[PDB]
Each structure stands twice: as structure tokens, then as C-alpha cells.
Write a protein that holds these residues in place. Structure first.
Motif, mmCIF file in Angstrom:
data_model
loop_
_atom_site.group_PDB
_atom_site.id
_atom_site.type_symbol
_atom_site.label_atom_id
_atom_site.label_comp_id
_atom_site.label_asym_id
_atom_site.label_seq_id
_atom_site.Cartn_x
_atom_site.Cartn_y
_atom_site.Cartn_z
ATOM 1 N N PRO A 21 0.814 -1.225 0.000
ATOM 2 C CA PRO A 21 0.000 0.000 0.000
ATOM 3 C C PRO A 21 0.842 1.267 0.000
ATOM 4 O O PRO A 21 1.145 1.819 1.063
ATOM 5 N N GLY A 22 1.221 1.735 -1.188
ATOM 6 C CA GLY A 22 2.065 2.909 -1.303
ATOM 7 C C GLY A 22 3.008 2.879 -2.490
ATOM 8 O O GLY A 22 3.695 3.867 -2.765
ATOM 9 N N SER A 79 3.723 2.118 -6.779
ATOM 10 C CA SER A 79 3.124 2.572 -8.028
ATOM 11 C C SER A 79 3.468 1.577 -9.125
ATOM 12 O O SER A 79 4.649 1.325 -9.388
ATOM 13 N N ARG A 104 -4.893 10.690 -7.964
ATOM 14 C CA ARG A 104 -3.620 9.992 -8.129
ATOM 15 C C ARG A 104 -3.548 9.136 -9.391
ATOM 16 O O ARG A 104 -2.460 8.662 -9.735
ATOM 17 N N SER A 122 0.428 5.482 -5.763
ATOM 18 C CA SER A 122 0.141 5.580 -4.322
ATOM 19 C C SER A 122 -1.119 4.795 -3.946
ATOM 20 O O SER A 122 -2.163 5.359 -3.611
ATOM 21 N N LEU A 123 -1.003 3.470 -4.065
ATOM 22 C CA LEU A 123 -2.110 2.563 -3.781
ATOM 23 C C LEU A 123 -2.459 2.567 -2.296
ATOM 24 O O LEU A 123 -1.588 2.711 -1.434
ATOM 25 N N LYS A 124 -3.745 2.418 -2.003
ATOM 26 C CA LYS A 124 -4.259 2.402 -0.644
ATOM 27 C C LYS A 124 -4.804 1.015 -0.318
ATOM 28 O O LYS A 124 -4.717 0.081 -1.119
ATOM 29 N N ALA A 125 -5.371 0.887 0.880
ATOM 30 C CA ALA A 125 -5.958 -0.367 1.331
ATOM 31 C C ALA A 125 -7.369 -0.587 0.802
ATOM 32 O O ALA A 125 -7.898 -1.697 0.931
ATOM 33 N N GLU A 126 -7.988 0.436 0.216
ATOM 34 C CA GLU A 126 -9.328 0.341 -0.345
ATOM 35 C C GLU A 126 -9.321 0.109 -1.853
ATOM 36 O O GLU A 126 -10.390 0.057 -2.468
ATOM 37 N N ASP A 127 -8.143 -0.076 -2.452
ATOM 38 C CA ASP A 127 -7.998 -0.235 -3.894
ATOM 39 C C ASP A 127 -7.776 -1.691 -4.296
ATOM 40 O O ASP A 127 -6.999 -1.976 -5.211
ATOM 41 N N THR A 128 -8.454 -2.622 -3.624
ATOM 42 C CA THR A 128 -8.362 -4.043 -3.950
ATOM 43 C C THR A 128 -9.391 -4.473 -5.002
ATOM 44 O O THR A 128 -10.078 -5.492 -4.859
#
Ligand SMILES: CC(=O)N[C@@H]1[C@@H](O)[C@H](O)[C@@H](CO)O[C@H]1O
Lengths: 49, 118, 107
Positions: free
Chosen positions: B14-15, B17, B67, B85-91
Motif C-alpha cells: 500500500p504505497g 506505483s 492519483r 500511491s495505492l491504498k488499502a481500499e484499492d483491492t
């Protein structure tokens, strides 16, 4: 051309002339041939015609 | 035969690219647009933005204005998306779509990049 | 912004029957609606575009009709291998909105 033979705004026009210049939406690479207009017309158009 | 291959199942922090692939073949690539949709496993399809195939301008949707960056490489018919900048909600999976400037129906054929994040 | 809904949510069907699923829009999308089909673990494909016409290369067991805010298709000969979540898609106003889904199930 656009006033006389396409779409005339009146001489005592009360209103806003809201318009945006979009290049993303209405431009096709090769040409959007759907949008059309007139050059030659034998009558000056009255407003809202 | 027209088909749109995609990359493998990405799995990153998570973070980071990464860059997924959507390679086009068969049709005229400069004629139509190159829309992208995403699909959460507990939700449905959401339209997220398109790009023009000769200028490469990345116009996005009104929700994800931030982003996400699309990068076009012309004359190869590749249509890469670059999530940053991937997050935890981008699954969610990301589907590729050919949706033209005039007709504007998606017809989503795309195998599905399984972007699992943890 | 179009609250795009469809009824019924989960309906069952049998072999070779005539099923009718409808899908409704809040605002007028009068002649621009597209119909999709999605099997699990499979990307969708166009079935009926502009709510009347059909694509060449699809099996013509079904046809589509409707205008205004009431839209449907009728599958005149169903087969058990479909069992899929059917989707509507309008084409009138931004942003472009799908439907929730009508999943077909066998008894
Ligand atoms: C041919 C034509 O323009 N017909 C009518 C016009 O007579 C009328 O003034 C306007 C608004 O009432 O609606 C329209």
C-alpha cells in the motif's frame, strides 16, 4: 454567416451567451463530420428560427 | 479477430506505483476512445475516465480526480494505466474498454487485472 | 447521476421458457440504452444496442424493445447455460451509469 443564415440573435436580446470551447469531447481524429452548417442560403433568418 | 490482452495479477504494498497493460490489435486504434472502468468485489462497474488516441490527454471522472494517471504510447497500440500511491481500499479489478467519441457504449472485454493489496 | 434500477432482483427460470426482465431510468434516456450479459469470471459483451437494434454475430434467441423510461428485452428461447447477471447501460448524460443486476438462476 452565423448571424444571417444560421441562427440570429435579436437586436434587443436579453440573455446570456454561455459557451465553452471543448476540444476533448467534440473533436474526432480524422474529422467529426456529424456537426454541420450552411454557407449558402437565399434568406436572412429572423431571430429564433 | 479483435482482442485486448492484459497484464498479470499484481500484488504490491500500500504505497507503491505500478503500471498495467492493455494492448490493442485488429482494429483502427486511432478511431475510437480508450475508456477504463473498475470493479470492487462487493460493488459494480464505475466509469473512471478515457483518453484520446492521438493527443493522449488524460481526462478523468469526477470522483477519482487525483492519483490516477493514464499514459498512452502511440504507434504500438498500447494503452497503459499507471496507478500511483495505492491504498488499502484499492483491492479492485480494472477492466479495459473501447468506447468511441461518438457512440459511447463501453462493451467491456478485458480479462481482469487482479490487483490484490494488503 | 441517473438512478438506474431494474426489477426483479433475483428471479428463477426454467428450460425453454419466455422470460421478461425490465429496467427503468429516473430521467429520460428515450432511445439510447444498451443491454449486456456477464457470466461469473467472464468479461461482458454487447447484446442489444440503442434498445432496438442487434449486433451481427450474437445468437438471436432474444430481441429488445422499449422507449421513454421503460426498457426491456425478451428472451424467446432460454437455455440453461446462461445463468448470468444482466446489465443495462444508457447513453444520454454524464456520468455513465450501469444497473445493479438481474441474475438468472435454474431451479
Ligand atoms: C413554427 C413556430 O415557430 N411555432 C411556434 C411559435 O409560433 C410560437 O411563438 C412559439 C412559442 O409559443 O412556439 C413555436
Amino acid at each position: 454567416n452565423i448571424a444571417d443564415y444560421n441562427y440570429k440573435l435579436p437586436d434587443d436580446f436579453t440573455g446570456c451567451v454561455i459557451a465553452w470551447n471543448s476540444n476533448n469531447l467534440d473533436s474526432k481524429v480524422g474529422g467529426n463530420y456529424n456537426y454541420l452548417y450552411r454557407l449558402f442560403r437565399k434568406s436572412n433568418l429572423k431571430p429564433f428560427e | 479477430q479483435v482482442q485486448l490482452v492484459q497484464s498479470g495479477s499484481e500484488l504490491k504494498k500500500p504505497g507503491a506505483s505500478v503500471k498495467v497493460s492493455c494492448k490493442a490489435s485488429g482494429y483502427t486504434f486511432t478511431d475510437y476512445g480508450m475508456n477504463w472502468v473498475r470493479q470492487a468485489p462487493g460493488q459494480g462497474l464505475e466509469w473512471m475516465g478515457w483518453i484520446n488516441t492521438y493527443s493522449g490527454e488524460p481526462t478523468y471522472a469526477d470522483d477519482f480526480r487525483g492519483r490516477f494517471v493514464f499514459s498512452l504510447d502511440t504507434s504500438v497500440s498500447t494503452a497503459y494505466l499507471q496507478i500511483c500511491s495505492l491504498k488499502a481500499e484499492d483491492t479492485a479489478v480494472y477492466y479495459c474498454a473501447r468506447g468511441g467519441n461518438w457512440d459511447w457504449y463501453f462493451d467491456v472485454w478485458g480479462q481482469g487485472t487482479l490487483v490484490t493489496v494488503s | 447521476d441517473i438512478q438506474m434500477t431494474q426489477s426483479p432482483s433475483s428471479l428463477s427460470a426454467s428450460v425453454g421458457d419466455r422470460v421478461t426482465i425490465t429496467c427503468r431510468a429516473s430521467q429520460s434516456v428515450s432511445n439510447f440504452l444498451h443491454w449486456y450479459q456477464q457470466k461469473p469470471g467472464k468479461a461482458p459483451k454487447l447484446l442489444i444496442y440503442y434498445a432496438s437494434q442487434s449486433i451481427s454475430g450474437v445468437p438471436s434467441r432474444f430481441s429488445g424493445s422499449g422507449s421513454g423510461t421503460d426498457f426491456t428485452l425478451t428472451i424467446s428461447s432460454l437455455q440453461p447455460e446462461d445463468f448470468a447477471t444482466y446489465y443495462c447501460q444508457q447513453s444520454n448524460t454524464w456520468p455513465l451509469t450501469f444497473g445493479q443486476g438481474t441474475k438468472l438462476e435454474i431451479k
